[PDB]
Design a protein around this ligand. Structure first.
Ligand SMILES: N#Cc1ccc2c(Oc3ccccc3OCCn3ccc(=O)[nH]c3=O)cc(F)cc2c1
Ligand SMILES: [Mg+2]
Lengths: 546, 409
């Protein structure tokens, strides 16, 4: 009540809400006047004599009716505020305290006074006697529920009411979150209970009620989908439904639960389950689950059968993070400080790059984990990674991008990250030289792929249902098939040269996978490029053939 | 101390950028720096009724400076503060035999900022793990990194500098935000003594400068492309040469290549040697003579902001081109510096970007938007670790540049 108000404007040019009242049923009108006389006696609202042009509607709903006040037309018109704390603390980032209590602030918004000049814009009206008589005219003296400014003004008002108490108690830790205060301390019990009663009295002096020690929440705390325990944290228990049929809505809910669990349960995989969502977004469209998807789901149920817990942060200990590969471009990791307990866990996936590579994906995962470490603890982990120094050094030296590689050390746990093949940097003396080309018709969608070599060999292969780029990859696949373990290849396609000079380990296109196999098998492969249709020689004859 | 009113371009709200997560060390440096600035009056804490936010960073030489990213507030003010309080850009600064840069941002911190405008300079010091909503400030004086600060101060600056200009007519002095470029054709010792003269003159009038770093824009601008000059050429070398000339031909009108193409008449093996014809040298030498000239008809366009592309070359080298339209380069060059115990791809890239931006400022008075070859989130994490300029270029992150890596070195 004595709290300093936060000044509040209307948006420029805009003026306050004038909205006609809807008719109200007889049972609701008296039930509203009943709440209003009590809110007035408490000073939260006040009657007005209509020199005030504004009005907004008032609904009622329910052994105790509650009052509702639609405020969209006013929230449309008031100024923006500082955005109200997006996100929440991660329990892996909390530090243990010998005592923790949770105070619910009751009537939170109605305890903080509204700015005076702005109050006139919250006027509302109760119709009386079937619109035969004028109704009462109230207006708010405190933050309305559902007003656009209430959460942020209450946040800063609370932060200002806590200032003297934090100043007098440097060692006590307070977390704000909406209606709640979370107080932790290393005081011996009883001294902590005394400090909690001190803070409660200080809060009540500013007009903020809080639960009695008989009503304060008991550990473990059920908070935002976590179980917060005195010495460990975990997610609240996950339930995966068993259904005879699955809509896109159900697969969304399931993928969400599985991602949520993945922060503490290691090894959860989401690739095949989410490939089901790649199609049209119609929410009710029933989709059969695929074989690999139900295998993934059962393998997830296997990990979720056994409960798992995480530990809280200790600043004195080093921050270690370890990464393991799984199938189809999936990676899992643990952030930990101690050998048998994790701070948290997680996953990463290649997220729709058409062709990728194990070292690139491992680097992107280290990037994701570095960003998570900075967010959650304000530092970056020491890394333990399944890759040798020569492998990563060779990749980051050949690679066209710049890249930061943090301090890391080898962990010889298979699968290992390796370079599966290397193109030669210079042409191979003594190795056959294929000139290759491929061409297709964009309308009829049939094409040809072929090659011509310096030994004198020539070949052409028909193709149905193909595209002009797919044929040029097919021509290279042909030269790889028909050569010895050392082969020079000369293509006229920028696209194929880009796909293959990236040295992918994997692709969503089966033809590129079939090329990758041949590249791992061949001992040496030099790939060269020349412009098409320039009569270069070699390429001229291959282009004539196709 | 009467504030200059500051108005935004019509229909334009204030900046509302998100503030990056920062490590605990950098948050502590920002908290100390701001705790001091608040009691010097330069900044003040603000309430929930201020919605705007601008990003803040901490950089380093052995102590932490704060660095505000005013790019969004600059787009929404200075573009109407270039048409109104714009700073003309001399064309002689690109020609002087030497150019030194001097930091003079401290001068802004006396001058009050317009009372109605301060809300738009709000910034947030993050908490770790969202423990708290951040510490929340706004500026009460002209902020460094805002492009309105030099524009408001420029009358005082041209006044303070005028007697030194009358003493030394041939020196060139240009101001881009916090920095003062000073160019002379003097011998390097005379140039540095004149720079110290300007430093002492600036001190007598109450402008401190940090030092207690020269450019040479006789740069040989936009270097010609070079063909390899091998003693003997195989089919592979001729193929790479013909493809490189063919890419050049979409830039240089007169390239001829047919008598190099007939030189590979057969379906030869890649490593077979081929003698060059008396006809084929007519291609090679003449394409070299035509490759050793500037492109005709390439002019700088004020209406269109500059673009800069970079390509990693290996061995610590980086090629770059500043251009406004494709294949119409206004400048190209190569950055190269390495120390094995002190260099990596991001350090080299950030140093190259600062060097290119400095060249761009000396030449045209505005900065390019980079097309950086790096993962987005990697750069967003690590770029501050080697940043040193008070200004920040615009940038985006570009997919693969294929095979041109050989074509630009
Ligand atoms: N309902 C509820 C709720 C409850 C508590 C929350 C919370 O306690 C803390 C407040 C201040 C310092 C540390 C804190 O927690 C450390 C972890 N922790 C938790 C419980 C326990 O018994 N012991 C223990 O070590 C922090 C928080 F971020 C959210 C909280 C939410
Ligand atoms: Mg072709």
């Amino acid at each position: 009540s004595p709290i300093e108000t936060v000044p509040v404007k209307l948006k420029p040019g805009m003026d306050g809400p004038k909205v006609k009242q809807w008719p109200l049923t007889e049972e609701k009108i008296k039930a509203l006047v009943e709440i209003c006389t009590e809110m007035e006696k408490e000073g939260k609202i006040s009657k007005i004599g209509p020199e005030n042009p504004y009005n907004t509607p008032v609904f009622a709903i329910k052994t105790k009716w509650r009052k509702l006040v639609d405020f969209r037309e006013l929230n449309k018109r008031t100024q923006d505020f500082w955005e109200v704390q997006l996100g929440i603390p991660h329990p892996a980032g909390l530090k243990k305290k010998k005592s923790v209590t949770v105070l619910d602030v009751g009537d939170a918004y109605f305890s903080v006074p509204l700015d005076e000049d702005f109050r006139k814009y919250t006027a509302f009206t109760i119709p009386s006697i079937n619109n035969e008589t004028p109704g009462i005219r109230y207006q708010y003296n405190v933050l309305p529920q559902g007003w656009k400014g209430s959460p942020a003004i209450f946040q800063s008002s609370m932060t200002k009411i806590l200032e003297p108490f934090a100043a007098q108690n440097p060692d006590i830790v307070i977390y704000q979150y909406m209606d709640d205060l979370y107080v932790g301390s290393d005081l011996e019990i009883g001294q902590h209970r005394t400090k909690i009663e001190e803070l409660r009295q200080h809060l009540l002096r500013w007009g903020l009620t809080t639960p009695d020690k008989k009503h304060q929440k008991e550990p473990p705390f059920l908070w935002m989908g976590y179980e917060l325990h005195p010495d460990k944290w975990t997610v609240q228990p996950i339930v995966l439904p068993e259904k005879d049929s699955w809509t896109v809505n159900d697969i969304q809910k399931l993928v969400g639960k599985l991602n949520w669990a993945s922060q503490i349960y290691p090894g959860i995989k989401v690739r095949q389950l989410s490939k089901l969502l790649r199609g049209t977004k119609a929410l009710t469209e029933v989709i059969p689950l695929t074989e690999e998807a139900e295998l993934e789901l059962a393998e997830n149920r296997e990990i979720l059968k056994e409960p798992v817990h995480g530990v809280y942060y200790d600043p004195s200990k080093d921050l270690i993070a370890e990464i393991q590969k799984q199938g189809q471009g999936q990676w899992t990791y643990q952030i930990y400080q101690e050998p048998f307990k994790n701070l948290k866990t997680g996953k990463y996936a290649r997220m729709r790059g058409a062709h990728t590579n194990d070292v690139k994906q491992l680097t992107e995962a280290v990037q994701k984990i570095t960003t998570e470490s900075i967010v959650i603890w304000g530092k970056t982990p020491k890394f333990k990674l399944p890759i040798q120094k020569e492998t990563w050094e060779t990749w980051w030296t050949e690679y066209w991008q710049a890249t930061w590689i943090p301090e890391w050390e080898f962990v010889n746990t298979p699968p290992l990250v390796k370079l599966w093949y290397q193109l030669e940097k210079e042409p191979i003396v003594g190795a056959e030289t294929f000139y290759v080309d491929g061409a297709a018709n964009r309308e009829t969608k049939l094409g040809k792929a072929g090659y011509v070599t310096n030994k004198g060999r020539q070949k052409v292969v028909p193709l149905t249902n193909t595209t002009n780029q797919k044929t040029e990859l097919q021509a290279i696949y042909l030269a790889l098939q028909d050569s010895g373990l050392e082969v020079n290849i000369v293509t006229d396609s920028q696209y194929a040269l880009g796909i293959i000079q990236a040295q992918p380990d994997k692709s969503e296109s089966e033809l590129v996978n079939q090329i990758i196999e041949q590249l791992i098998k061949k001992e040496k492969v030099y790939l060269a490029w020349v412009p098409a249709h320039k009569g270069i020689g070699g390429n001229e004859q291959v282009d004539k053939l196709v | 101390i009467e504030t200059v009113p500051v108005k935004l371009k019509p229909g334009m709200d204030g900046p509302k950028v998100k503030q990056w997560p920062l490590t605990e060390e950098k948050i502590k440096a920002l908290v100390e720096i701001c705790t001091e600035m608040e009691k010097e009056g330069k900044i003040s804490k603000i309430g929930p009724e201020n919605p705007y936010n601008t990003p803040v960073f901490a950089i380093k030489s052995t102590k932490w400076r704060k660095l505000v990213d005013f790019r969004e507030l600059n787009k929404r003010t200075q573009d109407f503060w270039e048409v109104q309080l714009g700073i003309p850009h001399p064309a002689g600064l690109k020609k002087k035999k030497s150019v030194t840069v001097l930091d003079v941002g401290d001068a802004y911190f006396s001058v009050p900022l317009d009372e109605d405008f301060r809300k738009y300079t709000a910034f947030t010091i993050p908490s770790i793990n969202n423990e708290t909503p951040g510490i929340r400030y706004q500026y009460n004086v002209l902020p460094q990194g805002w492009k309105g600060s030099p524009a408001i101060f420029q009358s005082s600056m041209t006044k303070i500098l005028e007697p030194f200009k009358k003493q030394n007519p041939d020196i060139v002095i240009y101001q881009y935000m916090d920095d003062l470029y000073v160019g002379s054709d003097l011998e390097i010792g005379q140039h540095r003594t004149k720079i110290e003269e300007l430093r002492q003159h600036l001190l007598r009038w109450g402008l401190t400068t940090p030092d207690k770093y020269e450019l040479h824009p006789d740069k040989w601008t936009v270097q010609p492309i070079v063909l390899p000059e091998k003693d003997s050429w195989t089919v592979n070398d001729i193929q790479k040469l013909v493809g490189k000339l063919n890419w050049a031909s979409q830039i240089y009108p007169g390239i001829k290549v047919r008598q190099l193409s007939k030189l590979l008449r057969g379906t030869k093996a890649l490593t077979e040697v081929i003698p060059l014809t008396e006809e084929a040298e007519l291609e090679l030498a003449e394409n070299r003579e035509i490759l050793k000239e500037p492109v005709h008809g390439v002019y700088y366009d004020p209406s269109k902001d500059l673009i800069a592309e970079i390509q990693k070359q290996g061995q610590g080298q980086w090629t770059y081109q500043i251009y406004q339209e494709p294949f119409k380069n206004l400048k190209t060059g190569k950055y190269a510096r390495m120390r094995g115990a002190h260099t990596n791809d991001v350090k080299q890239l950030t140093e190259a970007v600062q060097k290119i931006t400095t060249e761009s400022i000396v030449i045209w008075g505005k900065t390019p938007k980079f097309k950086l070859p790096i993962q987005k989130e990697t750069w967003e994490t690590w770029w501050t670790e080697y940043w040193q300029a008070t200004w920040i270029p615009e940038w985006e992150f570009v997919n693969t540049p294929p095979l041109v890596k050989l074509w630009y070195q």
